[PDB]
Amino acid sequence: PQSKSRKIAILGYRSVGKSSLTIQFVEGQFVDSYDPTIENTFTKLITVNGQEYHLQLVDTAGQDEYSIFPQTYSIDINGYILVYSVTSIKSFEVIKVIHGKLLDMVGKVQIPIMLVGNKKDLHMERVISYEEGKALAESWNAAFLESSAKENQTAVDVFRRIILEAEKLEH
Ligand SMILES: Nc1nc2c(ncn2[C@@H]2O[C@H](COP(=O)(O)OP(=O)(O)OP(=O)(O)O)[C@@H](O)[C@H]2O)c(=O)[nH]1
Ligand SMILES: [Mg+2]
């Protein structure tokens, strides 16, 4: 099929850069301001290994350890991008919680999860190492990657990887 349609949900603690990361991939530029997100939805094309896709990304509202995981993100989503900020020990802690909640609701289903460490560029304020994010991602059997909403290439690879992990379970 010339074109496949896959829906992606982007979850994580507030201000980690879910929007920026998404904007970078879709529009191509790095938005420098900060407007908390209620929920934006972009539909962009992207080819992964010759297969073109009609990617529908759901850039969700930041969540914290207490917030309840929304049910519409619980069904009919082909892949999840769980992102956190390497400049925040808090985003990392919260992501572990959101991951568990996600798995609960999704029931016993083979849904592809991918962990992303954002703000790779903010060297001076990095508080989490690469190896720590990796370990976690390995505890989940999820593809791990670090990225920078300013480094467009790293933003494209995040969404490219989720597709890659998607097709894997399908097959
Ligand atoms: N230096 C740097 N700043 C970033 C990066 N990614 C995001 N930011 C900044 O982090 C702040 C918040 O980014 P957002 O994309 O709004 O984060 P968010 O998770 O969408 O925010 P919520 O919708 O509330 O969850 C903004 O100032 C972004 O410009 C990055 O890779 N490097
Ligand atoms: Mg936002």
Curated annotation (Swiss-Prot):
What changing residue 47 to A does, per the record, is:
Causes slightly reduced phosphorylation of EIF4EBP1
Where along the sequence does the record place the motif called Effector region?
A: 34-42
GO terms for biological process, alphabetical: cellular response to nutrient levels; negative regulation of cold-induced thermogenesis; oligodendrocyte differentiation; positive regulation of oligodendrocyte differentiation; positive regulation of TOR signaling; positive regulation of TORC1 signaling; regulation of cell cycle; regulation of macroautophagy
Query: Which InterPro entries does the record associate with it?
Result: P-loop_NTPase, Small_GTP-bd, Small_GTPase, Small_GTPase_Ras-type
**What result is annotated for mutating residue 55 to A?**
Partially deficient in guanine nucleotide binding. Fully impairs EIF4EBP1 phosphorylation and RPS6KB1 activation
Gene3D superfamilies, per database record: P-loop containing nucleotide triphosphate hydrolases
Asked if the keyword Phosphoprotein belongs to this entry, the reply reads yes
Impact upon substituting residue 63 to L: Has a higher basal GTPase level, however, is still sensitive to TSC2 GAP activity. Increases affinity for MCRS1
Task: Cite the position(s) of the site with description Important for autoinhibition of GTPase activity.
Answer: 34
Which tissues show it?
Answer: Ubiquitous. Highest levels observed in skeletal and cardiac muscle.
Record's protein name: GTP-binding protein Rheb
Tell me what organism the protein belongs to.
Homo sapiens (Human)
Q: What is the lineage of its organism?
A: Eukaryota, Metazoa, Chordata, Craniata, Vertebrata
